[PDB]
């Protein structure tokens, strides 16, 4: 046998190459930075009407003006989000004003790769998480969308997609989405791209949208708002 | 072959398990059988999954250890081969005898 910790002759670690694949398994999430605000769209993709569609969430709040859509293993991401909630309010106690998209994202990413399978502390990871997070909000600086990877490489984006359609969708965004496309048009761009990975057509019970716009706090779109974008796709 | 036994539940059990499989289904001679495969063992450890369950084996037999009766019955048929002198109780020899086998 050989370990998993080892570097391969390719020049990459095994555990990490697997973790990227974990991102690819889940549901697709689109986070678009427009200069009118930042919208995050995610597919519900429900298979049963007995479910209550409000409680299927994959947009969770890091902050009260930053929203986050997450992709890959839904469970694995949730822990990172739990630690993020404590930091944003903590930031309020110390600085006396609310956390930025950049500050929160770099701090979670340090934890992302730490892995030592044997002879490493139980207060530290044995394996990396297979989640890609999309932190999208507008903060003191302005609309910012930052993308976080399970490899712990953070980069600033304007349009990013992650999940099963991740490479396909990301290329397709670069095409339609530009900074000569308005916020409502970003919502239309995401909906079209969403359909190949979805098993059915787009509906207001099969998307969840939330936009954080200047001068406003995070709003979870209501059934009427979801339905107005459904009418024209 | 004690080494075969503790190694993975017998190399000798391997032969038994296969013969038992062959005998479970074979040609049109599944219907009638007059060839059995019999195992002697003295452990329960060696017993794999096909051996352990009943309605896969016709019987699992538990032997009663040698008692006072068993020593007599075996002694009596043995004592005939040689000359004996009158007034010797066969009962007496067996009962003293603690044995450990026939």
């Amino acid at each position: 046998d050989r370990g998993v910790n080892t570097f391969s002759p390719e020049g990459r670690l095994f555990q990490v190459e697997y973790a990227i694949e974990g991102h690819k398994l889940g549901s697709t999430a689109i986070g678009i930075q427009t200069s009118e605000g930042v919208c995050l769209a995610v597919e519900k993709r429900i298979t049963s009407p007995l479910m209550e569609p409000s409680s299927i969430e994959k947009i969770v709040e890091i902050d009260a003006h930053i929203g986050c859509a997450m992709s890959g293993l839904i469970a694995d991401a949730k822990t990172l989000i739990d630690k993020a909630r404590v930091e944003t309010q903590n930031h309020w106690f110390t600085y006396n004003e609310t956390m930025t998209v950049e500050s929160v994202t770099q701090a979670v990413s340090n934890l992302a790769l730490q892995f030592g399978e044997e002879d490493a502390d139980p207060g530290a990871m044995s394996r990396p998480f297979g989640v890609a997070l999309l932190f999208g909000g507008v903060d003191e600086k302005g609309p910012q969308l930052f993308h976080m990877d399970p490899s712990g490489t953070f980069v600033q984006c304007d349009a990013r997609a992650i999940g099963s359609a991740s490479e396909g969708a990301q290329s397709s965004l670069q095409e339609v989405y530009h900074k000569s496309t308005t916020l409502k048009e970003a919502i239309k761009s995401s909906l079209i791209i969403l359909k190949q990975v979805m098993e059915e057509k787009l509906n207001a019970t099969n998307i969840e949208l939330a936009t954080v716009q200047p001068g406003q706090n995070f709003h979870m779109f209501t059934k009427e708002e979801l339905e107005e974008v459904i009418k024209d796709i | 072959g004690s080494s075969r036994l503790e190694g993975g539940s017998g190399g000798d059990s391997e032969v038994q398990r296969t013969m038992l499989e062959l005998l479970n289904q074979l040609d049109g001679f599944e219907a009638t059988k007059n060839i059995k495969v019999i195992m002697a063992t003295n452990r329960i450890d060696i017993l794999d999954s096909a051996l352990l369950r009943p309605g896969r084996i016709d019987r699992k037999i538990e032997f009663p250890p040698p008692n006072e009766e068993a020593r007599l019955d075996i002694l009596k048929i043995h004592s005939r081969k040689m000359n004996l002198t009158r007034g010797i109780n066969l009962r007496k020899i067996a009962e003293l005898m603690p044995g450990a086998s026939g």
Binding site: - | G10, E14, E21, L26, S49, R53, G55, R56, K60
Partner: protein, 385 residues
């Protein structure tokens, strides 16, 4: 219907007619086959003589020679002589050679080895489909792989998909992975090859992948065929300590299975049935899809269902309805099909022992009692919750 019948009569006639017409008429004719052809056959007999040294054709080489190892314990380089065709002969056959000058006169011999006999164990089940109680559907999913391309290959080829081969029968055992293998074989009415997995691991070193190759050869000719490999799990966990092949021998044999299944050389319409108690102790590639297409878990048969199967069992070991049918069933909580057999099989033994031909209630209670020592009833599952 009418067009088919006339066609068949004609086909049969044409082989016969042509062969015959040329011969007898050329006997009248003053130059063609005539005398020569009849003579040529006579001439093979006289040239060969008696005795004849036997050989086995390993391969024919296209250079006017073949490699036939003669029965004398040395190899011979034979030539196509004594009137014979090189291409006509197919590999692995035993051939007759003229001793006086090495020539293959012809082919008729095989000289039958005991290895093929061990492999071919024909079917004749104890119980079979449509005398088994409950979970009717569970059998039907199995059929998708095994039975259904044998019954009708038509549906599969027309759909245009890879013909399903290979199945893993897994779950806790008590459901009749063995019973299901026998049952499918009777119903399909195709050749049944039975080789136990333990048999692959031999006291000889390196014979194991060879034995696989032969198994699959014997299947291809026989085909449509089903191969039941009972208990694949046995070779991986165990080290019998009858070989020094080790972990390496298991590994090479498992690999040889893959090669024969799809590989570079495929074997036509050989399905594989793998009973296994577990799926985590098995080799990774062996259980990868595309060597199986259907994966199925057997959960244990239900406490109500045990009753519907029992009526049948009691009737087989002579019907009595004086039995406490319900009590025997109840104490045992959701476990093996094997226990129902044990309780009837034993009871009937006891009845005979008592000296009767009728199994009664007392006999059923007695057998039950003996069965609790032998097994553990269903008392394990009770203790936990």
């Amino acid at each position: 219907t009418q067009c088919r019948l006339k066609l068949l009569k004609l086909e049969r006639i044409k082989d016969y007619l042509l062969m015959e017409e040329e011969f007898i008429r050329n006997q009248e004719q003053m130059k063609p086959l005539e005398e020569k052809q009849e003579e040529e056959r006579s001439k093979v007999d006289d040239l060969r003589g008696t005795p004849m040294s036997v050989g086995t054709l390993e391969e024919i080489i296209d250079d006017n020679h073949a490699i036939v190892s003669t029965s004398v314990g040395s190899e011979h380089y034979v030539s196509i002589l004594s009137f014979v065709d090189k291409d006509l002969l197919e590999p692995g056959c035993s051939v007759l050679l003229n001793h006086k000058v090495h020539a293959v006169i012809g082919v008729l011999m095989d000289d039958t080895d005991p290895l093929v006999t061990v492999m071919k164990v024909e079917k004749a089940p104890q119980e079979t489909y449509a005398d088994i109680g409950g979970l009717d559907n569970q059998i039907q999913e199995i059929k998708e792989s095994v039975e259904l391309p044998l019954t009708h290959p038509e549906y599969y080829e027309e759909m245009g998909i890879k013909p399903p081969k290979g199945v893993i029968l897994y779950g806790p055992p008590g459901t009749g992975k063995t019973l299901l293998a026998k049952a499918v074989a009777n119903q399909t009415s195709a050749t049944f090859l039975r080789v136990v997995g333990s048999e692959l691991i031999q006291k000889y070193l390196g014979d194991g992948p060879k034995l696989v190759r032969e198994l699959f050869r014997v299947a291809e000719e026989h085909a449509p065929s089903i191969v039941f490999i009972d208990e694949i799990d046995a070779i991986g966990t165990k080290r019998y300590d009858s070989n020094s092949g080790g972990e390496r021998e298991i590994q090479r044999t498992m690999l040889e299975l893959l090669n024969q299944l799809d590989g570079f050389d495929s074997r036509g319409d050989v399905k594989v049935i793998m009973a296994t108690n577990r799926i985590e102790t098995l080799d990774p590639a062996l259980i990868r899809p595309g060597r199986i297409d259907r994966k199925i878990e057997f959960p244990l048969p239900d406490e109500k269902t045990k009753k519907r199967i029992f009526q049948i069992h009691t009737s087989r070991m002579t019907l009595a309805d004086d039995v406490t049918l319900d009590d025997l069933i109840m104490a045992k909580d959701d476990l093996s099909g094997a226990d129902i057999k044990a309780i009837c099989t034993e009871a009937g033994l006891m009845a005979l022992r008592e000296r009767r031909m009728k199994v009664t209630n007392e006999d059923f209670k007695k057998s039950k009692e003996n069965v609790l020592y032998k097994k553990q009833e269903g008392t394990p599952e009770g203790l936990y919750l």
